[PDB]
Structures are given as C-alpha cells and as structure tokens.
Amino acid sequence: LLKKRAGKSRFVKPRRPYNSEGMTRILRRYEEDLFCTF
C-alpha cells in the first residue's frame, strides 16, 4: 500500500460536423464539372 501510494501519488480541435441529406450537389474540379441532381 505504501509503495502503491508513493508510485501513484508521490489540443487540436475537431471540425464542425457537415451534413447534407436530400440536397442536390454542384461539384467543380479543375478538368470537369458535375451536377448530382435528384
């Protein structure tokens, strides 16, 4: 008990959650454009 008492007794933050359910997507890269509709 004495040895245990002596040995035991003597940041970057995450991003906000992004959600998009049932929402159309417009997407744009360098070489091609996309339009994911419904």
Binding site: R16, Y18, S20, T24, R25, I26, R28, Y30
Partner: protein, 118 residues
C-alpha cells in the same frame, strides 16, 4: 434630418483579406434552392485550406462565375468577391462562356492577412 446629415461618425473596422487560387468548389443546395451550404478549397503557392460557405458567399460565387482555377480575393468584413483573373489556363473549354479572362500569376506567401479599414 438636415441637421443630423452634417455630423459624421468615423468607425474603425477589422477585416481579413483572403487571396489565392481556387482548387475545388462544392455547393450543396436543397430542391427548391432555399437552403445553401458548401465547402471552398482555395490555395496559394505555399498553403492550402478548405473553408466553409454561407448563403451570401454562395450567392456571390454564383454571380461572376468562378470556374476552379480563377484567382479571387475575398474581403471577410465587406463580403466582396473580386475575380482578378485566370491562372490555370485549362485545356477543356465548352462553348457556354464568352469571356476573355486575363492571365495572372498564382499568389505566394500567406493566404490570410489582417487589415484595418476606416
């Protein structure tokens, strides 16, 4: 009203200037087009950051249409989009656009700067 028009108030403001090269634009809208949100990936020669967009930022991006390779400058407090020119000079171009956008260089140094306006 004539008396009060002759007294001016000079207001100090803090703003942030963001200039860089656009990598990828993602815009998510609802079916009726009311709710709008999305993510913007902008970069300079050194850094690269993924931002978040609101309603008025998306509305400012839809007008003066940016095509993922244009060089823009954003004022955070004023909310102004200015398209300086095109730097990527992409090969594949479809005939739905008639502008003759200028050849500018990709900016270097810090992506975000702090400025004071009056």
């Amino acid at each position: 009203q004539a008396f009060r028009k002759s007294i001016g108030i000079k207001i100090k403001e803090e703003t942030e200037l963001i200039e860089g090269e656009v990598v990828e634009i993602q815009i998510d809208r609802s079916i009726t087009g009311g709710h709008k949100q999305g993510k913007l990936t902008i970069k300079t020669t050194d850094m690269e950051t993924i931002y978040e967009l609101g309603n008025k930022m998306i509305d400012g991006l839809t007008k003066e249409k940016v095509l993922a390779g244009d060089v823009i400058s954003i004022d955070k407090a004023s909310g102004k989009i200015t398209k300086l020119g095109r730097s990527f000079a992409r090969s594949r171009d479809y005939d739905a656009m008639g502008a003759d956008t200028r050849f500018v260089q990709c900016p270097e140094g810090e992506l975000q700067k702090r400025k004071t306006v009056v």
